[PDB]
Symmetry: C3
Subunit: 134 residues, 3 copies
Amino acid sequence: LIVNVINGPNLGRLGRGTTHDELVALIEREAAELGLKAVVRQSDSEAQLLDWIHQAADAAEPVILNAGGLTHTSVALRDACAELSAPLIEVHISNVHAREEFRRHSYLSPIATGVIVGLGIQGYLLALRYLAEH
Amino acid sequence: LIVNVINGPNLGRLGRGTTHDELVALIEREAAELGLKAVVRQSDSEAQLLDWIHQAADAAEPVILNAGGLTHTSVALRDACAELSAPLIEVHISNVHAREEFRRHSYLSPIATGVIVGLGIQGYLLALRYLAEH
Amino acid sequence: LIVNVINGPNLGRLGRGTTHDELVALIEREAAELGLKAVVRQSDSEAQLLDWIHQAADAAEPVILNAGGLTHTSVALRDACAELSAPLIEVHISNVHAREEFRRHSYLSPIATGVIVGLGIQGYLLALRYLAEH
Ligand SMILES: O=C(O)[C@@]1(O)C[C@@H](O)[C@H](O)C(OCc2cc3ccccc3s2)=C1Cc1cccs1
Ligand SMILES: O=C(O)[C@@]1(O)C[C@@H](O)[C@H](O)C(OCc2cc3ccccc3s2)=C1Cc1cccs1
Ligand SMILES: O=C(O)[C@@]1(O)C[C@@H](O)[C@H](O)C(OCc2cc3ccccc3s2)=C1Cc1cccs1
């Protein structure tokens, strides 16, 4: 049943139209409809994100991760994620391939099961549906 | 009146001749002379720096930012700064163009109003004077 | 007598055969045999690692540093380490030259006294022995 949705730096600033709290609500509702339980967490702290990934590794739970800027920069986060035995779906709200070159490189994509970008907040919901059907 | 001066990693080690406390004193005095209030904050924690940038975004206040090593490495910090509606002045005490190649690239400069480097601690004071006259 | 052994992100996950606690035990025992005192610390937080490096700088104590993913990414950590007056030995358990290209670049190596990689946990013990004989 359990899927961990982990949001990284700046994701708490969503909507300041959809706020981060509203995103949590949308994800939780969709998870319920799919027979899952979504646990949604956000932090601007890499160490906090690492701890949540460690917990998912210990629990053998899947992760939907939007790491924000750390996607492009953090080897530590990638390496934490490499311990996950369950699927890892990388999500970006924006199309990271449509702006600065540096955003087109992700440390996470090579070790993720898959990646969804540019489909807005629905990307999280589509990631949930992937996990439900697998 | 209010200008946020935000110092990143290692800036607390200044003078260990001018210490970070002495830098705060110099900035506060100059701000007073210019009819401004400077709020000076330093942290080695990226998450703390992000929170201070978020607060400046919410308050529509300008920021003078010396991000230390994060200047060259942090997309998360750049992205937080992109939310600022008021001016962002990037400051470096040292001339970052006169040593290692990696220091000559800043994630902040492309989104800053302007950048002052190599003028020592006076760089902060000159940034204050820019904001006062604008 | 005192050598600071500082472990960065993900090192707390060792053995989850040798756990991080067992690594601490092995290092402490070897330090004792060499007439040293090893102080072993681990954190997933860059800010915490920076504080431990600052303390070693203030105490003029040597550092054996395995920075984990931050080895490849953190200018802030490198810059903190540049304040150290005593030796800095960079250690990696794995051979960082035998996998992804990005692991073959270290911000720490150019400012370290030396570097040991790929010799497993014994790398820490060999670093201790270097410091003991110098
Ligand atoms: O597309 C993403 O999900 C992304 O992982 C791309 C990543 O390159 C960037 O650091 C980021 O962080 C930069 C941000 C921009 C922004 C705009 C409006 C409200 C909040 C935020 S946070 C985000 C996260 C995004 C969320 C929404 C659009 S991008
Ligand atoms: O020039 C800067 O302001 C800079 O943002 C350049 C940046 O590349 C570097 O990570 C850093 O951080 C490296 C440091 C060096 C140093 C030397 C003496 C006392 C404190 C510090 S902290 C600094 C910050 C600087 C402050 C003073 C000189 S450079
Ligand atoms: O070789 C190292 O010491 C290294 O600094 C290499 C570095 O590139 C990597 O981020 C890391 O962090 C990735 C990790 C992998 C792993 C595997 C088994 C148990 C724990 C960990 S943590 C480590 C630290 C390592 C420890 C053991 C093997 S690599």
